[PDB]
Design a protein around this ligand. Structure first.
Ligand SMILES: N[C@H](Cc1c[nH]cn1)C(=O)N[C@H](CO)[C@H](O)c1ccc([N+](=O)[O-])cc1
Ligand SMILES: [K+]
Ligand SMILES: [Mg+2]
Ligand SMILES: [Mg+2]
Ligand SMILES: [Mg+2]
Ligand SMILES: [Mg+2]
Ligand SMILES: [Mg+2]
Ligand SMILES: [Mg+2]
Ligand SMILES: [Mg+2]
Ligand SMILES: [Mg+2]
Ligand SMILES: [Mg+2]
Ligand SMILES: [Mg+2]
Ligand SMILES: [Mg+2]
Ligand SMILES: [Mg+2]
Ligand SMILES: [Mg+2]
Ligand SMILES: [Mg+2]
Ligand SMILES: [Mg+2]
Ligand SMILES: [Mg+2]
Ligand SMILES: [Mg+2]
Ligand SMILES: [Mg+2]
Ligand SMILES: [Mg+2]
Ligand SMILES: [Mg+2]
Ligand SMILES: [Mg+2]
Ligand SMILES: [Mg+2]
Ligand SMILES: [Mg+2]
Ligand SMILES: [Mg+2]
Ligand SMILES: [Mg+2]
Ligand SMILES: [Mg+2]
Ligand SMILES: [Mg+2]
Ligand SMILES: [Mg+2]
Ligand SMILES: [Mg+2]
Ligand SMILES: [Mg+2]
Ligand SMILES: [Mg+2]
Ligand SMILES: [Mg+2]
Ligand SMILES: [Mg+2]
Ligand SMILES: [Mg+2]
Ligand SMILES: [Mg+2]
Ligand SMILES: [Mg+2]
Ligand SMILES: [Mg+2]
Ligand SMILES: [Mg+2]
Ligand SMILES: [Mg+2]
Ligand SMILES: [Mg+2]
Ligand SMILES: [Mg+2]
Ligand SMILES: [Mg+2]
Ligand SMILES: [Mg+2]
Ligand SMILES: [Mg+2]
Ligand SMILES: [Mg+2]
Ligand SMILES: [Mg+2]
Ligand SMILES: [Mg+2]
Ligand SMILES: [Mg+2]
Ligand SMILES: [Mg+2]
Ligand SMILES: [Mg+2]
Ligand SMILES: [Mg+2]
Ligand SMILES: [Mg+2]
Ligand SMILES: [Mg+2]
Ligand SMILES: [Mg+2]
Ligand SMILES: [Mg+2]
Ligand SMILES: [Mg+2]
Ligand SMILES: [Mg+2]
Ligand SMILES: [Mg+2]
Ligand SMILES: [Mg+2]
Ligand SMILES: [Mg+2]
Ligand SMILES: [Mg+2]
Ligand SMILES: [Mg+2]
Ligand SMILES: [Mg+2]
Ligand SMILES: [Mg+2]
Ligand SMILES: [Mg+2]
Ligand SMILES: [Mg+2]
Ligand SMILES: [Mg+2]
Ligand SMILES: [Mg+2]
Ligand SMILES: [Mg+2]
Ligand SMILES: [Mg+2]
Ligand SMILES: [Mg+2]
Ligand SMILES: [Mg+2]
Ligand SMILES: [Mg+2]
Ligand SMILES: [Mg+2]
Ligand SMILES: [Mg+2]
Ligand SMILES: [Mg+2]
Ligand SMILES: [Mg+2]
Ligand SMILES: [Mg+2]
Ligand SMILES: [Mg+2]
Ligand SMILES: [Mg+2]
Ligand SMILES: [Mg+2]
Ligand SMILES: [Mg+2]
Ligand SMILES: [Mg+2]
Ligand SMILES: [Mg+2]
Ligand SMILES: [Mg+2]
Ligand SMILES: [Mg+2]
Ligand SMILES: [Mg+2]
Ligand SMILES: [Mg+2]
Ligand SMILES: [Mg+2]
Ligand SMILES: [Mg+2]
Ligand SMILES: [Mg+2]
Ligand SMILES: [Mg+2]
Ligand SMILES: [Mg+2]
Ligand SMILES: [Mg+2]
Ligand SMILES: [Mg+2]
Ligand SMILES: [Mg+2]
Ligand SMILES: [Mg+2]
Ligand SMILES: [Mg+2]
Ligand SMILES: [Mg+2]
Ligand SMILES: [Mg+2]
Ligand SMILES: [Mg+2]
Ligand SMILES: [Mg+2]
Ligand SMILES: [Mg+2]
Ligand SMILES: [Mg+2]
Ligand SMILES: [Mg+2]
Ligand SMILES: [Mg+2]
Ligand SMILES: [Mg+2]
Ligand SMILES: [Mg+2]
Ligand SMILES: [Mg+2]
Ligand SMILES: [Mg+2]
Ligand SMILES: [Mg+2]
Ligand SMILES: [Mg+2]
Ligand SMILES: [Mg+2]
Ligand SMILES: [Mg+2]
Ligand SMILES: [Mg+2]
Ligand SMILES: [Mg+2]
Ligand SMILES: [Mg+2]
Ligand SMILES: [Mg+2]
Ligand SMILES: [Mg+2]
Ligand SMILES: [Mg+2]
Ligand SMILES: [Mg+2]
Ligand SMILES: [Mg+2]
Ligand SMILES: [Mg+2]
Ligand SMILES: [Mg+2]
Ligand SMILES: [Mg+2]
Ligand SMILES: [Mg+2]
Ligand SMILES: [Mg+2]
Ligand SMILES: [Mg+2]
Ligand SMILES: [Mg+2]
Ligand SMILES: [Mg+2]
Ligand SMILES: [Mg+2]
Ligand SMILES: [Mg+2]
Ligand SMILES: [Mg+2]
Ligand SMILES: [Mg+2]
Ligand SMILES: [Mg+2]
Ligand SMILES: [Mg+2]
Ligand SMILES: [Mg+2]
Ligand SMILES: [Mg+2]
Ligand SMILES: [Mg+2]
Ligand SMILES: [Mg+2]
Ligand SMILES: [Mg+2]
Ligand SMILES: [Mg+2]
Ligand SMILES: [Mg+2]
Ligand SMILES: [Mg+2]
Ligand SMILES: [Mg+2]
Ligand SMILES: [Mg+2]
Ligand SMILES: [Mg+2]
Ligand SMILES: [Mg+2]
Ligand SMILES: [Mg+2]
Ligand SMILES: [Mg+2]
Ligand SMILES: [Mg+2]
Ligand SMILES: [Mg+2]
Ligand SMILES: [Mg+2]
Ligand SMILES: [Mg+2]
Ligand SMILES: [Mg+2]
Ligand SMILES: [Mg+2]
Ligand SMILES: [Mg+2]
Ligand SMILES: [Mg+2]
Ligand SMILES: [Mg+2]
Ligand SMILES: [Mg+2]
Ligand SMILES: [Mg+2]
Ligand SMILES: [Mg+2]
Ligand SMILES: [Mg+2]
Ligand SMILES: [Mg+2]
Ligand SMILES: [Mg+2]
Ligand SMILES: [Mg+2]
Ligand SMILES: [Mg+2]
Ligand SMILES: [Mg+2]
Ligand SMILES: [Mg+2]
Ligand SMILES: [Mg+2]
Ligand SMILES: [Mg+2]
Ligand SMILES: [Mg+2]
Ligand SMILES: [Mg+2]
Ligand SMILES: [Mg+2]
Ligand SMILES: [Mg+2]
Ligand SMILES: [Mg+2]
Ligand SMILES: [Mg+2]
Ligand SMILES: [Mg+2]
Ligand SMILES: [Mg+2]
Ligand SMILES: [Mg+2]
Ligand SMILES: [Mg+2]
Ligand SMILES: [Mg+2]
Ligand SMILES: [Mg+2]
Ligand SMILES: [Mg+2]
Ligand SMILES: [Mg+2]
Ligand SMILES: [Mg+2]
Ligand SMILES: [Mg+2]
Ligand SMILES: [Mg+2]
Ligand SMILES: [Mg+2]
Ligand SMILES: [Mg+2]
Ligand SMILES: [Mg+2]
Ligand SMILES: [Mg+2]
Ligand SMILES: [Mg+2]
Ligand SMILES: [Mg+2]
Ligand SMILES: [Mg+2]
Ligand SMILES: [Mg+2]
Ligand SMILES: [Mg+2]
Ligand SMILES: [Mg+2]
Ligand SMILES: [Mg+2]
Ligand SMILES: [Mg+2]
Ligand SMILES: [Mg+2]
Ligand SMILES: [Mg+2]
Ligand SMILES: [Mg+2]
Ligand SMILES: [Mg+2]
Ligand SMILES: [Mg+2]
Ligand SMILES: [Mg+2]
Ligand SMILES: [Mg+2]
Ligand SMILES: [Mg+2]
Ligand SMILES: [Mg+2]
Ligand SMILES: [Mg+2]
Ligand SMILES: [Mg+2]
Ligand SMILES: [Mg+2]
Ligand SMILES: [Mg+2]
Ligand SMILES: [Mg+2]
Ligand SMILES: [Mg+2]
Ligand SMILES: [Mg+2]
Ligand SMILES: [Mg+2]
Ligand SMILES: [Mg+2]
Ligand SMILES: [Mg+2]
Ligand SMILES: [Mg+2]
Ligand SMILES: [Mg+2]
Ligand SMILES: [Mg+2]
Ligand SMILES: [Mg+2]
Ligand SMILES: [Mg+2]
Ligand SMILES: [Mg+2]
Ligand SMILES: [Mg+2]
Ligand SMILES: [Mg+2]
Ligand SMILES: [Mg+2]
Ligand SMILES: [Mg+2]
Ligand SMILES: [Mg+2]
Ligand SMILES: [Mg+2]
Ligand SMILES: [Mg+2]
Ligand SMILES: [Mg+2]
Ligand SMILES: [Mg+2]
Ligand SMILES: [Mg+2]
Ligand SMILES: [Mg+2]
Ligand SMILES: [Mg+2]
Ligand SMILES: [Mg+2]
Ligand SMILES: [Mg+2]
Ligand SMILES: [Mg+2]
Ligand SMILES: [Mg+2]
Ligand SMILES: [Mg+2]
Ligand SMILES: [Mg+2]
Ligand SMILES: [Mg+2]
Ligand SMILES: [Mg+2]
Ligand SMILES: [Mg+2]
Ligand SMILES: [Mg+2]
Ligand SMILES: [Mg+2]
Ligand SMILES: [Mg+2]
Ligand SMILES: [Mg+2]
Ligand SMILES: [Mg+2]
Ligand SMILES: [Mg+2]
Ligand SMILES: [Mg+2]
Ligand SMILES: [Mg+2]
Ligand SMILES: [Mg+2]
Ligand SMILES: [Mg+2]
Lengths: 48, 275
RNA sequence: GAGCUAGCCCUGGCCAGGGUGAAGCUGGGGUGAGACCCAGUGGAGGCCCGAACCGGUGGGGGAUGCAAACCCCUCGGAUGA
RNA sequence: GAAUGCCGGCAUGAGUAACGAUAAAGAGGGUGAGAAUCCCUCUCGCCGUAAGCCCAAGGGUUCCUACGCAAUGGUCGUCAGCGUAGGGUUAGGCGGGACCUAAGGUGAAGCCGAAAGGCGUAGCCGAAGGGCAGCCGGUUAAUAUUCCGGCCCUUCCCGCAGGUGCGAUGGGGGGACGCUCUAGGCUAGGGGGACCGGAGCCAUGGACGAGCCCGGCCAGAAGCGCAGGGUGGGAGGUAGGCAAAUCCGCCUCCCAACAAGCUCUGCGUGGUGGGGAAGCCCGGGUGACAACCCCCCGAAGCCAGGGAGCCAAGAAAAGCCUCUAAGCACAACCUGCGGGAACCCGUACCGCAAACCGACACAGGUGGGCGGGUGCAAGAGCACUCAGGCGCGCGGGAGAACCCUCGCCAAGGAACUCUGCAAGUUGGCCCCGUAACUUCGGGAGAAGGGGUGCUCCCUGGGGUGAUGAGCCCCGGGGAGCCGCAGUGAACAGGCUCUGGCGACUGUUUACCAAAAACACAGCUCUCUGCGAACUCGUAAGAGGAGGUAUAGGGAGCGACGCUUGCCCGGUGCCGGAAGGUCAAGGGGAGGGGUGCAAGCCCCGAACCGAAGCCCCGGUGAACGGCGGCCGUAACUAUAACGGUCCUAAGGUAGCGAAAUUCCUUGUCGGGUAAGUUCCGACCUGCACGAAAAGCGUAACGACCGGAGCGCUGUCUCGGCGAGGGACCCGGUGAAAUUGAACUGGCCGUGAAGAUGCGGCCUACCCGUGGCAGGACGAAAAGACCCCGUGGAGCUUUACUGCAGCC
RNA sequence: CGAUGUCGGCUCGUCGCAUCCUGGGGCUGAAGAAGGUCCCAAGGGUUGGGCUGUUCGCCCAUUAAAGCGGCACGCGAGCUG
RNA sequence: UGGGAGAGGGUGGUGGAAUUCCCGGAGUAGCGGUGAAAUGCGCAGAUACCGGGAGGAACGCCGAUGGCGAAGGCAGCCACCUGGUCCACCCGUGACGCUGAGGCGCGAAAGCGUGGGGAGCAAACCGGAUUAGAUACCCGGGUAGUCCACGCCCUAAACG
RNA sequence: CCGAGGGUAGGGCCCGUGACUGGGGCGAAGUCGUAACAAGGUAGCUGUACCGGAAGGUGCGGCUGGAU
């Protein structure tokens, strides 16, 4: 049957993307934390 | 004269439709329609604030002239009478000798080809608009302004009207469609006659589908819900109300007056509604 | 977190084929004029049968599955909320 | 040494289950160390509204070629979507951007919020909608509307010629729209041809034939033709389209009008450029100088912004045309022609799937287009089949039980069972015919029956032609032929009588409930006069509604018919300028602390002082309520009638052993040989009853009862047969579980149900196929039940706060 | 209570005997036939239907008879539900 | 042809008296009602009086032993549309007539449907009396209805 | 071919009968009240509507077949 992951590149960038995170207090704290932890990718990788 | 159907379906047995007799034009004036942003009952926060809305037919909003003192003394020919999906009344397209065109809501008795005019000097005939002070006490009247220059607010639905009952100073006393007796300022404009399409209220929707066409989604009784949802919720089997009948939000919905007590307009309402 | 799900908003798309035959219209009959009756025309409908499509009624299977809800046979809707 | 401990390693179950659709395989030839599994050929089977082909998501090199086989592949592997390497994606016209707006998002101005932030007209962003210029063929191992070939086209710059009051983010027109139905003419696609082109074939009894088999087109500027779309022309007036206007709007006048005219699209033709089968021979060559024509069918596509009808009344903005403003009028724009200029990103491959979502090469899920032929009334249904693609990545044998899916069965025919559950039966089309009841629609496919193939003969109307032949479509009458059987295969209702509940179509517990539940049109009460009520938000702002009482909110009830009684004492709501109670505040009789003092400071009575409660009244489709005792009538029984207690008042009409009835299988009647169910009655209704509506009601229902006819492996009662497993051999190889085990019966005993203790009995050692009685078998730290001064959801006249309102 | 699945049916039995039948007896208010009651006896047998989930029970038609109990109210790693 | 009388009918306008309710003023101890009473209303200011307003229904005097209509029935006033009827002239037609099974139309009140309207009245209903009782008669309340539109119902001591 | 009739299926009319139920006629020796006939103690009757143990009452409109 229809499962829960239905990938959609535009939906991905517009929801979790860098510019979405930076718009918002919570989103900037996400990037701070990812950077502080040393994450290699601050944001999901999506192709455009 | 409402139109009836033979019972060739279960729903056609009761369904009735307007007869659209007075209608003479089946196309809106292009310069006078604009897109009507459907809301679904949802406010600017995205939240339902009026339950059970949405999903009805697409509509263009026709710009209606609710001032009319906009063009004192400039007469106009009643060019057409059109259907309007945004109100119960029909609308009349006016061609002004000015060259300008606009709509008013169609009074009862308006005739395509007759002329109308607004102003302190206009004849007391159907379709004309005047400040309230120059209309004879006793005439029925519609599309009444509440305060001067603020637009027509009263008696706008199909078959409605107000009646001038007397004068008192700068003000004149109206009986609103609700039977309320109210002072309205005498410089407020109004339009002699009653609103047309009186047979509107005799329409039988007929089936659940017709409500849906109108944007009315199904309405769910409190008694059909659970206690998280509604005061009338829960109970084993059916249940009587078990408490004073209440809204989804807990206030009582039989009798409880809701008009604000210290409201300034109270000084101008002579007698609360009948019935 | 509404890429699942629920509702709404905007903008597009889909619904083989067959059946029933409302109003109206024309003709005739009728009448003082009508109502109305008959034929033909007409093509209405949360109309009928039935694929796509949407479902999930009863039974059987499956049960460390092909599958963390599937399969077969049956069955509901299919111009409409 | 234990924590159902943690991490790791390794056992057991066990050579066991399984190896993922039952569409299917066989042989020959090659390659190689090795072959059921790779390549090639022949034969067989499967899909063919796909299991074929195109596109969009998503995936991201999986594409092509060489060389490989450790691992991945459920086996094998020489093969591969795997390892290594190299190659491969070419655009002014295709898609997106350098264009437009939609919801929404953002947001100059502005508004609001402790901060963070929330809003917000314009503007901007935002597409699968608008707009916009490329078709056919050829070429590579791999790209092609991109390269090449042919024939076309768009925009920008510059120039020339002609023309014009040129000029815009401003005005206007236009863009610009629904659903159902549908005309005319075409095209796509298809069928046929005695005609045209073609390698060839004559079998096995016949056929050298009007024989078989194959093919008989595609693109194309201008011009022309056919068919459609769009559009009235001129003058005068002008106060409206936030400036101006010659434009548009409005008024009047004049020729014109279902015409033509002008304009645009489709289709055809069209210079020219292409393609071109079978068979044959090793993708290619040949066929071939290929032919390239006639007839029929014919779209849901095109002309198109076509037409009619209906109500639920059907985006925007730019491109484009026109108007004028500053400006500028040696400019600028328009038209034609010429030369130059024309950027960025995508393009491989998979794409109903082994490359996407599902941990898997997973029987599941995934939007758009094309989807041939014949037959069956039609069709995208069904069967078969084209092109095209496949045989589903373990095989070989065997022919037990048992399982699954399937076929048939004597006599009986529901006797099965909770229930005809399941499976039979019925089954399409044409004709005949068809009941109660009914809201006159229906019920209705009611029920029931007859017809159905093929051949010859005669004949009726239509479409295309021409009015005829030819073709194609709809029929009618007669005479015959064969079989068990003619919708001969496949797809395709069993029916009736009678109750309950719900009017109806709909909706729901994604994954145990589809219903009688929810919704529903309709009915009533109630709130709301508009800066509405109400909802969300601290606010601003929004919804409501660009609505205005024939409207909007809330609540109950639930089509329709006939109806909906009595009680307002309590509660709620509504009304009530009197009274009673009432907080802060006002007031300040009087009293107190201190000071030598003027003074400073504290307490404080009467009296005034809201809402709310108290008090008076109204109100039931507001919360709700709607009795008991004794007596009495020519026999008995009963009680119309009387008395009496109590109440706010004592249940009306209708209905009743009911979705309600305890006693209970009440009693009686019906149906049955037999009826705890069913239906019809009665009424001592444990414990119906009138909008948590009462009693009915045609039609409807995958709802839940009862009965009958038809027909059956449901059963008496079982038998045989088929295939997929089970079994045997080769290959690969799990699982929960497991204190260790050398693990028998009885009668006893034992923490009360013992392989393990006692006594006796029985018993050589070890497996395989089978069955499930035990190992208080496995699984899950019992959901029941209790306990914990454990938790959480929900309620209220529990307590105490808060929002909100007064 | 770190689980011992609960009514009824189906299937499959097996045991007890306080015996329903069949076999053997004594007593009788046993003439015969038929029955009553007690003793012995567990070898075999002990029907098909209607109603209801029913066990039970009632009823129909038969019968030599239409027995009653135990086996975790025998039996859900055997089925039903 | 020429005239007459009339609540004949239909539509629309419109005038005054009275009842009820509401606002203002003035006023106070009751009012109302009956056979007599009581319920009811009234110091929360009633009744009686004056001023203003709303709204519905019915039209006093004329009015009659009257008029008109086929019957049911029809009554302020005005206008329009329209029926029947009588009279005088004796002009025209030339038996064109009478009746009427079926048919069709009209048909008081009550009643029904849909929607308005609602003052007064008033079934049902509630209360007070009366009474042996009083599901009545009398009194105080009160919903349908009585009124308008449209469509039904088709009855009567529809009687002379 | 037609055909007595037989069989299958569905309709129409008629008669007999049925748990139970509706009122009616008669009986008369009962119980309740007294609706009508007098102004019958509320004049009567009336079509209709709503109500009540019962005769009946009330409403609306009608008739006199109404006493004073
Ligand atoms: N039926 C469950 C057994 C079960 C369910 N799942 C796993 N075991 C049950 O109640 N079991 C318990 C034993 O664990 C017990 O035998 C029991 C069985 C039945 C009853 N009862 O009153 O019908 C009570 C008790
Ligand atoms: K336990
Ligand atoms: Mg999706
Ligand atoms: Mg992904
Ligand atoms: Mg995307
Ligand atoms: Mg996208
Ligand atoms: Mg998205
Ligand atoms: Mg973003
Ligand atoms: Mg910061
Ligand atoms: Mg990581
Ligand atoms: Mg790094
Ligand atoms: Mg992140
Ligand atoms: Mg009309
Ligand atoms: Mg109708
Ligand atoms: Mg109709
Ligand atoms: Mg009709
Ligand atoms: Mg119908
Ligand atoms: Mg119906
Ligand atoms: Mg409408
Ligand atoms: Mg209509
Ligand atoms: Mg109209
Ligand atoms: Mg339109
Ligand atoms: Mg516009
Ligand atoms: Mg709008
Ligand atoms: Mg809006
Ligand atoms: Mg917004
Ligand atoms: Mg937001
Ligand atoms: Mg809503
Ligand atoms: Mg309208
Ligand atoms: Mg209307
Ligand atoms: Mg309605
Ligand atoms: Mg609508
Ligand atoms: Mg509802
Ligand atoms: Mg519920
Ligand atoms: Mg919630
Ligand atoms: Mg709560
Ligand atoms: Mg609550
Ligand atoms: Mg409740
Ligand atoms: Mg409940
Ligand atoms: Mg209950
Ligand atoms: Mg419930
Ligand atoms: Mg409930
Ligand atoms: Mg319910
Ligand atoms: Mg309750
Ligand atoms: Mg409130
Ligand atoms: Mg105001
Ligand atoms: Mg759209
Ligand atoms: Mg469809
Ligand atoms: Mg027809
Ligand atoms: Mg028509
Ligand atoms: Mg149709
Ligand atoms: Mg249909
Ligand atoms: Mg349908
Ligand atoms: Mg249908
Ligand atoms: Mg769906
Ligand atoms: Mg299923
Ligand atoms: Mg089945
Ligand atoms: Mg089966
Ligand atoms: Mg499962
Ligand atoms: Mg399936
Ligand atoms: Mg299936
Ligand atoms: Mg269907
Ligand atoms: Mg269809
Ligand atoms: Mg439908
Ligand atoms: Mg230890
Ligand atoms: Mg363990
Ligand atoms: Mg463990
Ligand atoms: Mg461990
Ligand atoms: Mg561990
Ligand atoms: Mg070991
Ligand atoms: Mg192992
Ligand atoms: Mg084993
Ligand atoms: Mg497996
Ligand atoms: Mg199969
Ligand atoms: Mg091999
Ligand atoms: Mg091969
Ligand atoms: Mg095909
Ligand atoms: Mg991937
Ligand atoms: Mg490639
Ligand atoms: Mg590769
Ligand atoms: Mg390998
Ligand atoms: Mg290998
Ligand atoms: Mg290697
Ligand atoms: Mg492997
Ligand atoms: Mg695998
Ligand atoms: Mg591979
Ligand atoms: Mg290479
Ligand atoms: Mg190019
Ligand atoms: Mg550029
Ligand atoms: Mg833009
Ligand atoms: Mg913002
Ligand atoms: Mg776009
Ligand atoms: Mg383009
Ligand atoms: Mg081209
Ligand atoms: Mg290439
Ligand atoms: Mg110009
Ligand atoms: Mg412009
Ligand atoms: Mg528009
Ligand atoms: Mg559009
Ligand atoms: Mg539609
Ligand atoms: Mg073509
Ligand atoms: Mg064809
Ligand atoms: Mg030969
Ligand atoms: Mg051509
Ligand atoms: Mg043509
Ligand atoms: Mg002008
Ligand atoms: Mg060739
Ligand atoms: Mg050649
Ligand atoms: Mg040649
Ligand atoms: Mg179609
Ligand atoms: Mg816009
Ligand atoms: Mg200038
Ligand atoms: Mg020009
Ligand atoms: Mg650039
Ligand atoms: Mg690029
Ligand atoms: Mg490419
Ligand atoms: Mg593939
Ligand atoms: Mg699929
Ligand atoms: Mg597809
Ligand atoms: Mg994969
Ligand atoms: Mg999975
Ligand atoms: Mg595979
Ligand atoms: Mg798959
Ligand atoms: Mg094709
Ligand atoms: Mg067929
Ligand atoms: Mg067919
Ligand atoms: Mg099918
Ligand atoms: Mg295979
Ligand atoms: Mg396989
Ligand atoms: Mg074997
Ligand atoms: Mg048999
Ligand atoms: Mg039978
Ligand atoms: Mg039989
Ligand atoms: Mg049954
Ligand atoms: Mg069958
Ligand atoms: Mg069939
Ligand atoms: Mg019948
Ligand atoms: Mg009928
Ligand atoms: Mg039939
Ligand atoms: Mg039937
Ligand atoms: Mg044959
Ligand atoms: Mg088949
Ligand atoms: Mg069928
Ligand atoms: Mg029936
Ligand atoms: Mg019912
Ligand atoms: Mg239901
Ligand atoms: Mg239903
Ligand atoms: Mg009903
Ligand atoms: Mg329904
Ligand atoms: Mg439907
Ligand atoms: Mg469920
Ligand atoms: Mg569930
Ligand atoms: Mg789920
Ligand atoms: Mg669930
Ligand atoms: Mg779940
Ligand atoms: Mg299920
Ligand atoms: Mg369910
Ligand atoms: Mg259902
Ligand atoms: Mg419901
Ligand atoms: Mg109703
Ligand atoms: Mg709030
Ligand atoms: Mg706002
Ligand atoms: Mg608003
Ligand atoms: Mg708005
Ligand atoms: Mg509104
Ligand atoms: Mg409901
Ligand atoms: Mg009562
Ligand atoms: Mg009360
Ligand atoms: Mg009360
Ligand atoms: Mg009270
Ligand atoms: Mg209470
Ligand atoms: Mg006070
Ligand atoms: Mg003092
Ligand atoms: Mg109470
Ligand atoms: Mg209640
Ligand atoms: Mg009771
Ligand atoms: Mg009973
Ligand atoms: Mg009942
Ligand atoms: Mg009960
Ligand atoms: Mg009990
Ligand atoms: Mg009972
Ligand atoms: Mg019982
Ligand atoms: Mg019985
Ligand atoms: Mg019994
Ligand atoms: Mg039963
Ligand atoms: Mg039952
Ligand atoms: Mg009884
Ligand atoms: Mg009892
Ligand atoms: Mg309720
Ligand atoms: Mg109920
Ligand atoms: Mg009826
Ligand atoms: Mg029914
Ligand atoms: Mg349904
Ligand atoms: Mg159902
Ligand atoms: Mg069998
Ligand atoms: Mg066989
Ligand atoms: Mg077999
Ligand atoms: Mg086999
Ligand atoms: Mg076999
Ligand atoms: Mg012991
Ligand atoms: Mg033992
Ligand atoms: Mg030992
Ligand atoms: Mg020992
Ligand atoms: Mg021992
Ligand atoms: Mg032994
Ligand atoms: Mg065992
Ligand atoms: Mg086993
Ligand atoms: Mg053991
Ligand atoms: Mg066990
Ligand atoms: Mg056990
Ligand atoms: Mg478990
Ligand atoms: Mg547990
Ligand atoms: Mg635990
Ligand atoms: Mg525990
Ligand atoms: Mg526990
Ligand atoms: Mg649970
Ligand atoms: Mg316990
Ligand atoms: Mg405690
Ligand atoms: Mg404790
Ligand atoms: Mg708690
Ligand atoms: Mg355990
Ligand atoms: Mg003897
Ligand atoms: Mg003895
Ligand atoms: Mg024995
Ligand atoms: Mg024995
Ligand atoms: Mg025995
Ligand atoms: Mg039994
Ligand atoms: Mg029993
Ligand atoms: Mg015998
Ligand atoms: Mg036992
Ligand atoms: Mg046990
Ligand atoms: Mg026991
Ligand atoms: Mg027991
Ligand atoms: Mg037992
Ligand atoms: Mg047991
Ligand atoms: Mg058991
Ligand atoms: Mg079980
Ligand atoms: Mg059991
Ligand atoms: Mg077992
Ligand atoms: Mg077990
Ligand atoms: Mg008089
Ligand atoms: Mg007279
Ligand atoms: Mg003469
Ligand atoms: Mg003569
Ligand atoms: Mg009448
Ligand atoms: Mg009446
Ligand atoms: Mg009143
Ligand atoms: Mg008494
Ligand atoms: Mg009534
Ligand atoms: Mg009424
Ligand atoms: Mg008389
Ligand atoms: Mg015979
Ligand atoms: Mg009397
Ligand atoms: Mg008397
Ligand atoms: Mg009397
Ligand atoms: Mg009584
Ligand atoms: Mg009375
Ligand atoms: Mg009379």
């Amino acid at each position: 049957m229809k499962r829960t992951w239905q990938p959609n590149r535009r939906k991905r960038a517009k929801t979790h993307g860098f510019r979405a995170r930076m718009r918002t207090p919570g989103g900037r704290k996400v990037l701070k934390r990812r950077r502080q932890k040393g994450r290699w990718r601050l944001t999901p990788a999506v192709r455009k | 004269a409402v139109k009836k159907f033979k019972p060739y379906t279960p729903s056609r047995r009761f369904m009735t439709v307007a007869d659209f007799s007075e209608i003479t034009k089946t196309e809106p004036e292009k310069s006078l329609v604009k897109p009507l942003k459907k809301t679904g009952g949802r406010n600017n926060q995205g939240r339902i604030t009026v339950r059970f809305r949405g999903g009805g037919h697409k509509r263009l909003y026709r710009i209606i002239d609710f001032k009319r003192w906009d063009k004192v003394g400039i007469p106009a020919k009643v060019a057409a009478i059109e259907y309007d999906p945004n109100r119960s009344a029909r609308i009349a397209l006016l061609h002004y000798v000015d060259g300008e065109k606009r709509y008013i809501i169609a009074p009862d008795g308006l005739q395509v080809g007759q002329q109308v005019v607004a102003g302190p000097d206009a004849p007391i005939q159907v379709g004309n608009a005047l400040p309230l002070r120059f209309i004879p006490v006793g005439t029925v009247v519609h599309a009444v302004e509440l305060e001067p220059k603020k637009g027509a607010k009263l008696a706008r639905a199909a078959g409605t009207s107000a009646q001038i009952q007397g004068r008192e100073g700068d003000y004149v006393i109206l009986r609103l469609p609700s039977g309320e007796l109210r002072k309205v300022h005498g410089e407020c404009y109004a339009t002699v006659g009653a609103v047309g399409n009186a047979d509107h209220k005799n329409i039988v929707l007929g089936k659940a589908g017709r409500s849906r066409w109108l944007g009315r989604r199904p309405h769910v009784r409190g008694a059909a819900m659970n206690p998280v949802d509604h005061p009338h919720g829960g109970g084993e089997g059916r249940a009587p109300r078990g408490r004073p009948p209440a809204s989804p939000w807990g206030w009582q919905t039989k009798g409880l007056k809701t008009r604000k007590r210290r409201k300034p307009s109270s000084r101008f309402i002579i007698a609360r509604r009948k019935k």
